[PDB]
Amino acid sequence: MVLSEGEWQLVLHVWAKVEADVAGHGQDILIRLFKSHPETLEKFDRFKHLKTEAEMKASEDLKKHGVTVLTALGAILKKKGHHEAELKPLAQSHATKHKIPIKYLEFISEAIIHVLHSRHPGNFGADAQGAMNKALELFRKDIAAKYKELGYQG
């Protein structure tokens, strides 16, 4: 699939607002993911112990990881489809070391969309959400193709 420049503009415009507070958005997204789909938390031996939303919000370690996640995603989105080089090490670590199924990438995509919708209603109307969804679908499609080459695809 290919996004139009108009679609990338909608994605990068709302992303510019996300970058004003990377740590805060990273925290919101990861917490939303763990509350909505508790099973995903089991993949993080680093955070499995967190029992409540309050503990999650208080974790400095969780906030640091959210920044790492958003920084990696932001670098990919800014390539506007030319992300082959950036995707390789991510696909390798998530397929071979972390063992993250495609299903879980769908869950975090949903979490990202929910958070942007709540925090940026004026910059995340239907058209902007559709463009972000297309961008995340492209990301997942390419990661899935990589998983298959690496011998995981699941």
Rule CB under 6 A: is residue 108 a binding residue for ligand [Xe]? yes
Residue 82 annotated as part of some ligand binding site: no
Size of the site for ligand [Xe] (CB under 6 A): 20
Q: The tokens of 42 are what?
A: 């089991």
Could you please report the per-residue DSSP string of 16-78? HHHGGGHHHHHHHHHHHHHHH-GGGGGG-TTTTT--SHHHHHH-HHHHHHHHHHHHHHHHHHT
Q: What minimum distance in Å lies between the beta carbon of 66 and ligand [Xe]?
A: 4
Q: What minimum distance in Å lies between the beta carbon of 110 and ligand [Xe]?
A: 9
**From residue 61 to residue 80, what is the string marking binding to ligand [Xe] with x (rule CB under 6 A)?**
-----x--xx-----xx---
Q: How far apart (Å, rounded) are the C-alpha atoms in residues 152 and 100?
A: 10
Contacts of 12 (CB under 8 A, 6+ apart): 77, 78
Nearest by Cα to 44 from 87, 113, 97 = 97
From ligand [Xe], ligand HEM, none, interface partner of 138 (C-beta below 5 to 8 A by class): ligand [Xe]
**From residue 43 to residue 72, what is the string marking binding to ligand HEM with x (rule CB under 6 A)?**
xx-x---------------------xx--x
The correct pick among 10, 56, 91, 100 for binding ligand HEM (CB under 6 A) is: 100
105 burial level (CB within 10 Å; 0-12, 13-18, 19+): middle
Give the annotated binding-site residues.
65, 94
Contacting positions for ligand [Xe] (CB under 6 A): 26, 29-30, 66, 69-70, 76-77, 83, 90, 94, 105, 108-109, 135-136, 138-140, 143
